[PDB]
Design a protein around this ligand. Structure first.
Ligand SMILES: Nc1nc2c(ncn2[C@@H]2O[C@H](COP(=O)(O)OP(=O)(O)OP(O)(O)=S)[C@@H](O)[C@H]2O)c(=O)[nH]1
Ligand SMILES: [Mg+2]
Length: 170
């Protein structure tokens, strides 16, 4: 029997970066330009025999949005530089609301739009590296690395759960 884990996570980023489309791709495995507080996804991780149930929040209301979150995806649109400049503001808002740091994966979304991309891979890698965040290039449209981004976040939250278990068991 696998180990069981449950986490609330938050989708962060400016308007139209693809927060909803990424969540739809992850939970319902499709994409629709005309697709109209949280989604649920159950995910198995074979390498450690662990089962994760996720609450993926995507939206006073701000404080309830962040409360109880154990992780998040920090998205920007590689075709719009302003959305990349603002990811620091989203990180600060989350950490300030929670009054603590939570793991974040930096997600450079819409990488299928090669002809209109303005934020280079190395820029996102450097920001994530400066914050000890993982970095993922994703496309909700093609599905590229979408499941990987959530899976990597799950593994980090699991290792942090294990860290806390050991701290409480000295
Ligand atoms: N080409 C391409 N288009 C994408 C991708 N992800 C989202 N889009 C498109 O970009 C637009 C915005 O995506 P959306 O999911 O609504 O972002 P959002 O962050 O949820 O936007 P908001 O509701 O917070 S304002 C939509 O038209 C969607 O179809 C992607 O990976 N590749
Ligand atoms: Mg949305």
């Amino acid at each position: 029997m696998p180990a069981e884990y449950r986490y609330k996570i938050v989708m962060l980023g400016d308007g139209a970066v693809g927060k909803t489309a990424m969540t739809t791709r992850f939970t319902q495995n499709f994409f629709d330009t005309d697709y109209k507080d949280f989604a649920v996804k159950r995910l198995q991780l074979d390498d450690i025999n662990a089962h994760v149930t996720l609450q993926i929040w995507d939206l006073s209301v701000r404080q309830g949005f962040y409360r109880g979150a154990r992780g998040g995806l920090l998205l920007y649109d590689v075709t719009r530089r302003r959305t990349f400049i603002n990811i620091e503001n989203w990180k600060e808002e989350a950490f300030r609301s929670l009054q603590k740091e939570i793991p974040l994966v930096v997600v450079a979304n819409k990488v299928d739009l090669k002809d209109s991309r303005v934020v280079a891979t190395e820029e996102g890698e450097e920001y994530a590296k400066n914050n000890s965040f993982m970095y993922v290039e994703s496309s909700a449209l093609t599905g590229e690395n979408v499941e990987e981004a959530y899976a990597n976040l799950c593994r980090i939250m699991i290792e942090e759960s294990k860290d806390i278990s050991e701290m409480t068991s000295t």
